[PDB]
Amino acid sequence: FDAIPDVIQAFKNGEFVVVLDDPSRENEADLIIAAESVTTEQMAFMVRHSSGLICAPLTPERTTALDLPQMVTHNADPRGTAYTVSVDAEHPSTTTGISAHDRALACRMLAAPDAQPSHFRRPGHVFPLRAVAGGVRARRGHTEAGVELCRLAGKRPVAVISEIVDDGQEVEGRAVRAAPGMLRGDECVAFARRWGLKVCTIEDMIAHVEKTEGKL
Amino acid sequence: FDAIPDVIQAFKNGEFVVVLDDPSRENEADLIIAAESVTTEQMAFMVRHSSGLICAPLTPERTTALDLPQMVTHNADPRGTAYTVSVDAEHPSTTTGISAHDRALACRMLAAPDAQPSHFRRPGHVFPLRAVAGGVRARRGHTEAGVELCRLAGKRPVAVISEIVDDGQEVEGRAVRAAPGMLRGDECVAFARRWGLKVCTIEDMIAHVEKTEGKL
Ligand SMILES: [Mn+2]
Ligand SMILES: [Mn+2]
Ligand SMILES: [Mn+2]
Numbered sequence A, B: 001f002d003a004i005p006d007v008i009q010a011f012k013n014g015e016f017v018v019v020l021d022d023p024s025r026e027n028e029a030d031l032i033i034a035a036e037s038v039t040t041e042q043m044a045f046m047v048r049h050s051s052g053l054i055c056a057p058l059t060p061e062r063t064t065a066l067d068l069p070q071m072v073t074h075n076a077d078p079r080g081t082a083y084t085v086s087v088d089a090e091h092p093s094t095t096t097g098i099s100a101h102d103r104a105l106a107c108r109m110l111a112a113p114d115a116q117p118s119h120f121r122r123p124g125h126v127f128p129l130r131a132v133a134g135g136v137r138a139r140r141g142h143t144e145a146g147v148e149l150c151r152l153a154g155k156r157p158v159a160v161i162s163e164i165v166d167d168g169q170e171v172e173g174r175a176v177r178a179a180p181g182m183l184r185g186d187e188c189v190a191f192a193r194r195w196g197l198k199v200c201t202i203e204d205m206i207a208h209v210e211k212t213e214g215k216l
């Protein structure tokens, strides 16, 4: 596992970083990147290697500034995953909203300093997620982790996250994949090494933050 | 392009079929399958080859029976894509809701004849879509197309759909994909041929339906 400071540096450089939550929690690794400059090609990569449900962690301040209400009033998710209503980019170059170009665009726009509610179409294809006010020390999830990195690296308070799945193996000529699942632990590290990314645990992320904030 | 009747047969056999909307519309091809028996391995394949935003077209009757309210009251999507609130399977085998196993499960459950509102957690990771009452002749989209196939093939009135993207090409050792996009026209047919699937146009789907119903 890389050291948090080095993860921060990569993050600040516009790179994806691989982040693992606790084993007792989701025991999942997400690809987490700053939203402000996520490129079309990077988004293509993200879509290719993840679940494809591209989310955009952001602060409460941002949800209000941008008028992104919670998808549901009585949240039935066991983790309280804070989904807002979905969105597309209101931009002349947007078409159907699902292509890597469109989704990357929506992400950058949500992060733009001049962002306004009218900049987004609801519903759409990118999923903003409301990080809790107390950040990672309060809720140990990738949503908080992405916003925390943004803060740590001095970026716009909008990240992009998605889970790294195990797409199993191709079956020549058949519309199935054998033995799929979710990438875990060591396989996540290996995944990171393969693509030149830094990889860490939210747990170490918390330890980092505690250095300045103390234990919640 | 395959003949509708043959597409129907494949569909009835639990296969994915490749469906293209009009060029003047989305000009996209979706992987469309019956939800009632979508397998874990098939879902893995679907996730791997599509946008990863796995939707589940269903009837108004089903949205009411299962208490799936529209995600938004004032739908800003230019196509009026009918998203309901998202869901996960309330099942002991569900974990985080995003794995191919979990998503496939949610799909089958939404299609179960004994399905009840309490069977699903909201919000979640599968996206039900409300087909319009008039079906394909009324709205020429993949949502209607999936529900129509269900009807045509005598299946439960719940389909699973997702767009087939162009993930561009791998870039050895780099977290990017070059020249990504959406698969179109001939490339979609080729995609279908590659995986042993039938492929058709919603336009021919409409022509099929018109044989019995006349032009809307
Ligand atoms: Mn669409
Ligand atoms: Mn997570
Ligand atoms: Mn999750």
Ligand SMILES: [Mn+2]
Pocket: B021, B026, B028, B030, B141, B142, B143
């Ligand atoms: Mn479509």
